[PDB]
Write a protein that binds this ligand. Structure first.
Ligand SMILES: [Mg+2]
Ligand SMILES: [Mg+2]
Ligand SMILES: [Mg+2]
Ligand SMILES: [Mg+2]
Ligand SMILES: [Mg+2]
Ligand SMILES: [Mg+2]
Ligand SMILES: [Mg+2]
Ligand SMILES: [Mg+2]
Ligand SMILES: [Mg+2]
Ligand SMILES: [Mg+2]
Ligand SMILES: [Mg+2]
Ligand SMILES: [Mg+2]
Ligand SMILES: [Mg+2]
Ligand SMILES: [Mg+2]
Ligand SMILES: [Mg+2]
Ligand SMILES: [Mg+2]
Ligand SMILES: [Mg+2]
Ligand SMILES: [Mg+2]
Ligand SMILES: [Mg+2]
Ligand SMILES: [Mg+2]
Lengths: 155, 119, 73
RNA sequence: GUGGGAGAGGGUGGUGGAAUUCCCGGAGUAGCGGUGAAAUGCGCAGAUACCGGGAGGAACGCCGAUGGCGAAGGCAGCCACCUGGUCCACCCGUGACGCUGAGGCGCGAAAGCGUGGGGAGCAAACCGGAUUAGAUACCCGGGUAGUCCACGCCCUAAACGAUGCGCGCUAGGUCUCUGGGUCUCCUGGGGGCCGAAGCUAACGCGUUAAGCGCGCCGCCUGGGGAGUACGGCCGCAAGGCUGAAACUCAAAGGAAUUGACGGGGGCCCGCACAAGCGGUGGAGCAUGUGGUUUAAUUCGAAGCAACGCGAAGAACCUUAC
C-alpha cells in the first residue's frame, strides 16, 4: 500500500440476518473457499444459541464480538538501538478484524468435537465474558499499558 | 504528620530521571519521589511516564501531611519535565503557579567533554 | 518574530548614559534579567552598546537584576 | 598643529553576580548516577532532590552581530589608573623629511620546560566499568601532570585571506560599522555581498583585485628518500633555525566533467517491508543437485538470473558413458 490508502473492501449483507458482520465472521470460518459448509456451520451455531438461550442469535453474536475487541495493543518499534513494544489505540477497523479472527481461532481450539458447537459455545462464552477469545483480548490489552512507558513514541 | 496544606513542589527533570520534591513554604522537604522510587530502574526512570507516576507519588505522600496547594518550580529540561507539571495539577493539589528555575552559569566551569562541543 | 512594539518607541527622551534611571532601564530587560536585543529595544548599534554598559552598572549598584525566574509554563 | 569620534588595542590595581565542587546547619528517605542498554561508582557513618550559611578556584550569560580593536599571535562582567594605534573636520605649520628593507632587535596561539604558588571544574598518562572476534579506542566511573598566577625559558602552527609591503589608475548596485555635511543625500575611514572592463587552468578575483602599472623584500624549480643525515647556531630539556646526498620512481599534483558510490540529504516506486491467508524448513515418497561409489554412473547448467534446468517422455532405442 505504498500508493493509495487501500479502500476497505465492501461486503454482501447476510443471506439471513442480513448483516455484514455475520458474513465477515462466516468468512473467517470458511476455509478452502467452502463458503457453504462455513455458512451452514455458523447457522447451526445460531440455532444452538437459541436451544440454550432466551436471546436471539444475532444479538448474542454482536455481544461476543463486542467483548473481544481490543481497544489498545502493542506494536514493536525500532529505537536507534532497541526494539520497543509501543502501545497505541487499535483502529475501529482493525478492532473488528481482530475480534472476528480471535473468535474463530479460540473456538476451533475448544474441545467439543462438532465444529458448529464450538462456535456457538465460544460465542456464548464471549457473551458472558470468558473463553479463549476474550482472553487473547485481555492479554493484548494487558501488555498495552504495561509498556505505557513508551506511550511517548506515539507512532 | 505536621499539617502543611500549602507549600512548594520542586521538579528536577533530566534526560536520566525526574525527581519531585514537595516542601513547606520555607523550602524544607516534606516528602519526595522519583522514577526510581516509583519502581523503574536505569533507563525507564527518565521516561515521561515515570515522571507522571513519581509526580503523583510526591503528591499522595504529601497529601497525608495535609498538603493542599503547591507552587511548582521546574528545573532542567529533561524529558518528563512536562508530564510531571501535568500530574501535579490534576492530582487534587491546587497548583498555585509554575516557574522555571533551571540554573545556568554565566560561563563558569568547563563542562565535561560530553557537554562541551560549544566553545 | 518580535513584532511586539520596540521599547525605544514607547518612551520619551532619556539619557542612555544614566545608570540609575531604573524606571526606564527595567524596560530594556526581558521576563528574566536578560538585556533585550535590538530587534526588541529598537535601539541602534551605538545606542545599544551604551545601554549595556549602563544596565551593567545598574546591576552592580543593585538597582537592576542579573536574572529573574520565569513564571508560567 | 587645533578641534572632534569609535573601539573586547595593551599593562596594573580593584571589584560584581550566576554556576560547579567542598564544608556547616536544617528538613527529608532510599536511592542517586550514568547508558543503546549496562555496569564500575556514590548513598541508612543517611546519598540524590529542597532551604540557609561558609570557603575556594576558574570563567564571564543576556547585550553579541552576519559587529568592533590590534602588525601578527590575539583581545569581550564592571570600575579607576597608566599606555599604543587610528579616523574625520579645519585647512593652520615643516617643506620630499619618502617606499621597501638582507642582517640586527623585539613580539609571537597551544602544548612543553624551570623556580615558587595555587588547584573549583576539566582532564594526557593512568586505575576501573562496558563494547568487541580483539578494544592497549570510540561510551560510563574515577584520575596525576596540566589547565590558573608570578618570574624565567621554548619560537612552533591549517601562525590562513593558505593571497608580502607601499603608491597610482580602472563601472556600478547593495548591506553594515564609525566621522563630517548645506543630513532626500553627498562625502571620508573600516567590514560584507553582487557585479563593468579585465584577469584566471578552472574554481574564482573584480576600488578590501587574483585587473592595469612602478618600487623594495621573501620564496619556488618533478615525486620519494627528507624537513631526514652531517656541520653550525640557539635551547635546561623537549627540541628549534639552517639543510643535503647516495638511492629510487614517471609520475606526484591543481581545477573542472561524466559516472559509479555513501553506515549524505530531499522526493518516489515495487507482494520490498508492514497487514493478512496458505506453505517450505520436521515425516514418507516423487524429482533435480552436491558428495560419494563405480568398469561406467555421458555432458552441460552455479548466488539472485543453476538444482521437476537443456530432457514436451533413459528398459533396447534414445545415448553422447
Ligand atoms: Mg597651509
Ligand atoms: Mg615656505
Ligand atoms: Mg609562545
Ligand atoms: Mg600555555
Ligand atoms: Mg610549570
Ligand atoms: Mg571528571
Ligand atoms: Mg574519562
Ligand atoms: Mg567601502
Ligand atoms: Mg562604506
Ligand atoms: Mg566579463
Ligand atoms: Mg568551466
Ligand atoms: Mg565578487
Ligand atoms: Mg629530489
Ligand atoms: Mg620539526
Ligand atoms: Mg645545550
Ligand atoms: Mg547520490
Ligand atoms: Mg501486485
Ligand atoms: Mg509479511
Ligand atoms: Mg521435507
Ligand atoms: Mg562440453
Amino acid at each position: 500500500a505504498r500508493r493509495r490508502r487501500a479502500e476497505v473492501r465492501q461486503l454482501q449483507p447476510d443471506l439471513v440476518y442480513g448483516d455484514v458482520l455475520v458474513t465477515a465472521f462466516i468468512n473467517k470460518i470458511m476455509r478452502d473457499g467452502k463458503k457453504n459448509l462455513a455458512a451452514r456451520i455458523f447457522y447451526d451455531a445460531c440455532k444452538i444459541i437459541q436451544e440454550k438461550t432466551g436471546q436471539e442469535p444475532l444479538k448474542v453474536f454482536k455481544q461476543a464480538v463486542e467483548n473481544v475487541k481490543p481497544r489498545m495493543e502493542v506494536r514493536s518499534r525500532r529505537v536507534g538501538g532497541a526494539n520497543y513494544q509501543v502501545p497505541m489505540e487499535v483502529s475501529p477497523r482493525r478492532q473488528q478484524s481482530l475480534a472476528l479472527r480471535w473468535l474463530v481461532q479460540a473456538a476451533n481450539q475448544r474441545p467439543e468435537r462438532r465444529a458448529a458447537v464450538r462456535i456457538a459455545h465460544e460465542l456464548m462464552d464471549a457473551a458472558e465474558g470468558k473463553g479463549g477469545a476474550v482472553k487473547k483480548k485481555e492479554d493484548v490489552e494487558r501488555m498495552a499499558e504495561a509498556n505505557r512507558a513508551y506511550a511517548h513514541y506515539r507512532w | 504528620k505536621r499539617q502543611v496544606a500549602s507549600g512548594r513542589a520542586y521538579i528536577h527533570a533530566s534526560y536520566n530521571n525526574t525527581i519531585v520534591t514537595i516542601t513547606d513554604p520555607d523550602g524544607n522537604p516534606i516528602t519526595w519521589s522519583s522514577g526510581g522510587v516509583i519502581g523503574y530502574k536505569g533507563s525507564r526512570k527518565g521516561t515521561p511516564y515515570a515522571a507522571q507516576l513519581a509526580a503523583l507519588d510526591a503528591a499522595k505522600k504529601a497529601m497525608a501531611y495535609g498538603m493542599q496547594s503547591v507552587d511548582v518550580i521546574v528545573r532542567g529540561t529533561g524529558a518528563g519535565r512536562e508530564q510531571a507539571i501535568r500530574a501535579l495539577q490534576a492530582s487534587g493539589l491546587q497548583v498555585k503557579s509554575i516557574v522555571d528555575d533551571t540554573p545556568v552559569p554565566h560561563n563558569g566551569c568547563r563542562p565535561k567533554k560530553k557537554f562541551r562541543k560549544a566553545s | 518574530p518580535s513584532r511586539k512594539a520596540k521599547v525605544k518607541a514607547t518612551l520619551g527622551e532619556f539619557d542612555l548614559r544614566d545608570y540609575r534611571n531604573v524606571e526606564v532601564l527595567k524596560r530594556f530587560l526581558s521576563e528574566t534579567g536578560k538585556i533585550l536585543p535590538r530587534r526588541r529595544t529598537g535601539l541602534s548599534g551605538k545606542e545599544q552598546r551604551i545601554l549595556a554598559k549602563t544596565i551593567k552598572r545598574a546591576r552592580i549598584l543593585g538597582l537592576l537584576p542579573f536574572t529573574e525566574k520565569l513564571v508560567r509554563k
